[PDB]
């Protein structure tokens, strides 16, 4: 019964610049200094690999804790800059008056070498680069109405950034928590559930109830922003609040007398979108965060810390034991309290999956005012948070394999769930292998079938709505069920959560904010492409984790490590057997799969949702050509890539000309990467020998011997440039397109 308590060590480390002048001090191998250029790369590669610098878990934990303060401090500088640039280099104040006609802008370029052309005409008597980060919509929702309010937040952001860097220094050099402190998982969950998420949600509900709701109620009514009461006047004067919301006339007595229905005027359950702004009702959002606050505060009292009541996480795991799984969840608690990599593998997996869920829900239920009709912001936010989720998931596979090689110990794992999974890995991979082959034929083969039938003049033989049909009946049933939910299954909800299920479109400023989305044969085909490319990515990453330690090819792969190039040309060749190489290959397939996801979103929205409302009806940007054209590969090449890339390639001479340059430059970086992927360092080391000879001939040869990159660094350099070039190419193509037409 070890008590939960604060435990630190005083002055564990000395604050000196001595080690700043001795590169490689952290590692025994690199401390001796460089002899070849390979040393330089090894310095940066192993800088943050704490688990390999020392075998002491306590020393590892202390570095992780303070390295996290540095990450927090950097985000505050970044957040402070975004708020500061909104105050000083933006047209936010003009945007508040005419949100539907003025383009948000918060970056201005200096007039040098003729780059001032990038300062485009955005509206409000302002010249600058149009932004797609959606900060203007966020600031309006919170109630910000002046650049002074933006300026104060930026100054507060810098103070927080200074506090974060002080905390990191303090908790590493002055008062470093001990290992027993870090292992109070029950205590940490209690505070992070009820304290971080719980009180954070309640505190934000306080801001919305007292600041956001009154300010946005008057803004929607048409009141001039400068004439709206200041947030503190709303807080101090209950009389003003009563006018906007009569419930405030009764104070907090209804809350304590359980007459919660009195607050129905500002704690609503409307559903749908606000017709004036096209975003979610803020009164709905306030009741959301009040409900979420109570749920998490209750969640934070589940685990036992010091007073008997509560649950022991170890006891829960050991009680869940069945007939089919041997010992069961035994041994997981020790794994998850002694391996940082195991914790990181889980957290990256769900944090990445969460970021992808955010992308889907924010576009379908636009939570900010004027977010929906700003098509550039909608496209950018969905695409940004899909890419973030994709990288995090691939990292989850990377750090699951690191655990398997370094932190896995067979003695603690005998006949438990983890052990039994390893003992039928061939069954898992063989079945997942077949599923991927099945999904590739029956999804991408359909496109090849349609392309061949179309080229042969046999349109009646294609898979399409006017031909052999493939209707997503299951998805269509769910769309109808959610559309009728308010009638019978959610009686107290006035409207459906989203307008995608069905109903009538909402138009703001003559543009569609959201309307029902219909699923047809093309949607059926593209969705099963997603299932195919996701399943393949699982195969590559899961295979690396399950075979990290050994396989039928390399029986002792664990001893070789997590990151090695091969085990030589024997046995036919063993290139890229290490678990690190399964992340390297998994990155390509993740990039392949998410590229189709963001092409699917971009074409579907322009074709079927986005458009201009007129007297006759809705005219969409691409005129509803998704249904008939997206069933062939040729349709994607012609109608999507070739037609929509018109904007980016005609950008020269305009404010969007920067996107044209980056479109070419991205194409360059991508092709440049194939040099590293298609070659090997054997050629390059011999090439450097001849180059070194010329320098030797001129007495200008370096003391640090030039070396071709290692085998692994060639693969890492290749994939990093491949991803940057590919992703930046889509980034330029999307923004130049949507900003130009959207």
């Amino acid at each position: 019964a070890k008590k939960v308590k604060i435990a630190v060590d005083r002055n564990p480390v000395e604050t000196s610049f001595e080690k700043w002048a001795k590169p490689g001090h952290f590692s025994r191998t690199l401390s001796k200094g460089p002899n070849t250029t390979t040393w330089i790369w090894n310095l940066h590669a192993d800088a943050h690999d704490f688990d390999s610098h020392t075998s002491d878990l306590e020393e590892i934990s202390r570095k992780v804790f303070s390295a996290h303060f540095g990450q927090l401090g950097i985000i505050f500088i970044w957040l402070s800059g975004m708020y500061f640039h909104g105050a000083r280099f933006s047209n936010y104040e003009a945007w508040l008056s005419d949100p539907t006609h003025i383009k948000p802008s918060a970056q201005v370029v200096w007039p040098i070498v003729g780059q001032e052309i990038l300062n485009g005409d955005v509206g409000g008597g302002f010249q600058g680069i149009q932004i797609t980060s959606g900060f203007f919509q966020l600031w309006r929702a919170s109630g910000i109405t002046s650049e002074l309010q933006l300026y104060t937040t930026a100054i507060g952001g810098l103070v927080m950034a200074a506090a974060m860097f002080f905390a990191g220094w303090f908790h590493y050099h002055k008062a470093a928590p001990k290992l027993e402190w870090f292992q109070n998982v029950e205590s940490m969950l209690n505070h992070h559930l009820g304290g971080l998420l719980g009180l954070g949600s309640l505190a934000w509900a306080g801001h919305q109830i007292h600041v956001s709701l009154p300010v946005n109620k008057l803004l929607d009514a048409g009141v001039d922003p400068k004439e709206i009461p200041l947030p503190h006047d709303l807080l101090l004067n209950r009389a003003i609040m009563a006018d906007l919301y009569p419930s405030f006339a009764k104070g907090i007595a209804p809350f304590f007398t359980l007459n919660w229905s009195e607050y129905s005027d500002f704690l609503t359950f409307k559903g749908g979108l606000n017709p004036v702004t096209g975003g979610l009702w803020l009164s709905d959002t306030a009741h959301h965060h009040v409900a979420i606050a109570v749920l998490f505060l209750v969640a934070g009292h589940m685990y036992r810390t010091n007073w008997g009541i509560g649950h022991s996480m170890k006891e829960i795991l050991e009680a869940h034991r069945g007939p089919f799984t041997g010992e069961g969840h035994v041994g997981l608690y020790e794994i998850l309290t002694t391996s940082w990599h195991a914790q990181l593998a889980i957290n990256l997996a769900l944090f990445g999956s969460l970021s992808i869920i955010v992308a889907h829900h924010m576009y379908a239920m636009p939570p900010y005012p004027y977010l929906a009709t700003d098509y550039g912001t909608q496209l950018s936010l969905f695409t940004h948070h899909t890419w973030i989720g994709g990288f995090c998931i691939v990292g989850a596979g990377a750090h699951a394999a690191i655990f398997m090689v370094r932190d896995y110990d067979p003695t603690n794992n005998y006949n438990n769930l983890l052990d039994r999974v390893i003992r039928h890995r061939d069954a898992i991979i063989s079945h997942l292998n077949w599923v991927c082959i099945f999904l590739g034929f029956h999804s991408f083969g359909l496109y090849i079938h349609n392309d061949t039938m179309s080229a042969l003049g046999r349109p009646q033989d294609m898979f399409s709505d006017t031909a052999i049909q493939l209707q997503p009946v299951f998805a269509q049933w769910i769309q109808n069920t959610h559309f009728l939910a308010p009638q019978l299954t959610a009686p107290n909800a006035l409207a459906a959560t989203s307008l995608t299920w069905g109903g009538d479109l909402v138009a703001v400023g003559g543009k569609v904010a959201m309307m029902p989305i219909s699923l047809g044969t093309s949607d059926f085909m593209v969705h099963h492409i997603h299932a195919f490319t996701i399943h393949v990515t699982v195969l590559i990453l899961l295979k690396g984790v399950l075979f990290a330690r050994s396989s039928r090819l390399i029986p002792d792969k664990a001893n070789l490590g997590f990151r090695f190039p091969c085990d030589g040309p024997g046995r036919g060749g063993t290139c890229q057997v290490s678990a690190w190489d399964h992340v390297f290959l998994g990155l390509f397939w993740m990039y392949n799969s998410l590229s189709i996801v963001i092409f699917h979103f971009s074409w579907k929205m322009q074709s079927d949702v986005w458009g201009t409302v007129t007297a006759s009806g809705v005219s969409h940007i691409t005129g509803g050509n998704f249904a008939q054209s997206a069933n062939t590969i040729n349709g994607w090449l012609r109608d999507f890539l070739w037609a929509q890339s018109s904007q980016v390639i005609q950008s020269y001479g305009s404010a969007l000309s920067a996107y044209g340059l980056i479109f070419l430059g991205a194409h360059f970086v991508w092709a440049f990467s194939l040099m590293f992927l298609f070659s090997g360092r054997g050629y390059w080391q011999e090439l450097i020998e001849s180059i070194v000879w010329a320098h030797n001939k001129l007495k200008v040869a370096p003391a640090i011997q030039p070396r071709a990159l290692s085998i692994t660094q060639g693969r890492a350099v290749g994939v990093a440039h491949y991803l940057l070039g590919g992703i930046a190419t889509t980034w330029s193509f999307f923004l130049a397109r949507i900003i130009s037409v959207g």
């Binding site: 085990d567 030589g568 024997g570 036919g572």
Partner: protein
């Protein structure tokens, strides 16, 4: 079967024998070096060609060399 040759620059460090994951190499008495021992390759039919032995040889140039040759079930490292 691969071909493995030991050259007279061997210093008898034994690192090639330790590195080999198939017990292809062994040390034998010799008089051509201070260690009075030399590497030997009596069981090359079990060699797979991994070249871990070459990775472990300190001499420059190598004193143990592997020349990949005809393939077989053993040299191809198959368990099926």
């Amino acid at each position: 079967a691969h071909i493995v040759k030991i050259y007279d620059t061997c210093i008898g460090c034994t690192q090639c024998v330790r590195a080999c994951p198939l017990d292809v190499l062994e040390m034998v008495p010799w008089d051509g070096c201070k260690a009075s021992q030399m590497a030997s390759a009596p069981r090359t039919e079990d060699c797979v060609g991994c070249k871990r032995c070459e990775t472990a040889c300190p001499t420059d140039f190598l004193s143990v060399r592997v020349y990949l040759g005809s393939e077989s079930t053993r040299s191809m490292g198959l368990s099926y």
